[PDB]
User: Which sequence fits this backbone?
């Protein structure tokens, strides 16, 4: 009766073991070379502290050197810009990211901050340059955001070809929904994007052979809506922790489904690490 | 109950007359301010010369100063790059474009040339940075490529709100389909993008309250596929021989117009729909760049 469970915890563990061996091999080819990631944080949110620790731990396990810079809540845009410039110019840093959302007492234009990141170091793929390449099909020389990247990998774990499928993406954010659409489209799905102004959400969802949900609305996508045999990818982290999909009903209709926790979340961290290792390898050129 | 015809020739003429008045007024509000467009050409292709002259003439009618830089076929990539850098840095120039395709005896990386354009001057909207802003919903200050821009304008001429409609885009090219998707999405349509690998294209098309077709496949989208009451926007320019026409050839769209006009509530003809919009949209983007520069 139930959907096969796409176990992101196990899959991510296989990815991290491969990345580790790749990193060990780079270091034996070029001794003293150390791939390096930096994470710049503004403020002191509890959830951001937890996510960053998970990232630092994965990095150290793979043999990536990881630096965490934590700026106070008094930080201004102009101070964040100086750090980004410093990370851009530090040739020991192969990739870096800015943890979102920024936690400051001052107004900081997030887009302007992100877009000061040098594109070759933008391992989160959130610069307009990288978004622009992805959105137009040029996946050759481009970092892709870590969440959609992990989702695509989960979709591929089913062995079902994406080409020609009707995919539905619920959500259109910069971090998840919009790039998710792009990845599905340039893997030759026919893609429908939904958002908060979509009418008859249920009827749109029901057309998805592939369904990716990234709304942050706890369990709003009902199992009833899911197309029989669909692949269901659920990005939601909502406070127990639950997804954006009503799992117990959706599991009876899908052929493949991601649980929450242990689905998309661990896969996201593995892809960040993969992008980091890519940046380090490109720099060795 | 046949479709109202969206007359692109008339609408574009209204747009160009309003832009003129706006430009006259900017110059009176800030005397000495001169909106300025540059077009950089490489080589001497006949078709490019024709298109450029049309753009220069529209600009001069509106009161935009238009400069044409024409480099010879002997030009190298590094010389093209130097001109782009110079246009980027010339504070009198608010917008410029590079006419494509380049006509040189040397290898010139087109993508690299285009992507040296400063985003704030990229009136054709084809730089990666500008594509990226548009694709992620920064519609306040990015540039929009001229064809999808004109499509959106035609859709708005109907007075039917876009928000909550199911829009279908057939095609995903850099120049039309992809930016078209972005405009519809950030106007709050629910958007489906189809392409050459879409299965059951007819059934996908039939879900479109708004349909934009940009395939280059003459009359492939049949009237039977059109949802009743749909807005149909047809970007196709396909040449077919026809001895009964003044110049021995007709232009048809990517939509089978005669059958689609019986099903749509609004439809663009070909010729005379999307095509005449395009030069006016370039002019509109140029006026936007000049206004943003004016702070
Ligand atoms: N595992 C990870 O590392 C990770 C990373 C990022 C995100 N996520 C999770 O994924 C979820 C989404 O995050 P985000 O950054 O993409 O969030 P976000 O920026 O809040 O965007 C939510 C999106 O869902 C849409 N939406 C909201 N209510 C909806 C409704 N009733 N019907 C349809 N669409 C609706 C929004 O519509 P509008 O655009 O119209 O506002 C928007 O596009 C969250 O639970 C987040 O915690 C996880
Ligand atoms: N000023 C003007 O009037 C103007 C300006 C621009 C464009 N246009 C016209 O608009 C049309 C499209 O031009 P473009 O620049 O977008 O061309 P293009 O680069 O060739 O793009 C064609 C697009 O349509 C898709 N397509 C092709 N055959 C299809 C089929 N059988 N079923 C579904 N989708 C199919 C292609 O799919 P894949 O992506 O899968 O290959 C692609 O995304 C042309 O007639 C062009 O002349 C007019």
Assistant:
């Amino acid at each position: 009766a139930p959907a096969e469970i796409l176990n992101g915890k196990e899959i991510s563990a296989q990815i991290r073991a491969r990345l580790k061996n790749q990193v060990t091999q780079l270091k034996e080819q070029v001794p003293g070379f150390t791939p390096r990631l930096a994470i710049l944080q503004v403020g002191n949110r509890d959830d951001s502290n937890l996510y960053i620790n998970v990232k630092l731990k994965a990095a150290e396990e793979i043999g990536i050197k990881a630096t965490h810079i934590k700026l106070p809540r008094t930080t201004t845009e102009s101070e964040v810009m100086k750090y980004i410039t410093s990370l851009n110019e530090d040739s020991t840093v192969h990739g870096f990211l800015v943890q979102l959302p920024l936690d400051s007492e001052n107004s900081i234009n997030t887009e302007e901050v992100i877009n000061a990141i040098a594109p070759e170091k933008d391992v989160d793929g959130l610069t307009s340059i990288n978004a622009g390449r992805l959105a137009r099909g040029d996946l050759n020389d481009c970092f892709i955001p870590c969440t959609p990247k992990g989702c695509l990998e989960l979709i591929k774990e089913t062995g079902v070809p994406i080409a020609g499928r009707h995919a539905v993406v619920v959500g259109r954010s910069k971090i998840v929904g919009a790039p998710m659409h792009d990845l599905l489209l340039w893997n030759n799905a026919t893609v429908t994007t939904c958002h908060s102004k979509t009418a008859h959400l249920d009827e749109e969802v029901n057309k998805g052979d592939i369904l990716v949900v990234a709304t942050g609305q706890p369990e709003m996508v009902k199992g009833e809506w899911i197309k029989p045999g669909a692949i269901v990818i659920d990005c939601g982290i909502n406070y127990k922790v639950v997804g954006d999909v009503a799992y117990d009903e959706a599991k009876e209709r899908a052929s493949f489904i991601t649980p929450v926790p242990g689905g998309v979340g661990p896969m996201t961290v593995a892809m960040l690490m993969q992008s980091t290792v890519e940046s380090a390898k490109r720099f060795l050129e």
User: Anything to note?
Assistant: Strands of chain A lie at 4-5, 36-42, 65-71, 95-98, 166-170, 190-194, 210-213, 231-234, 256-257.
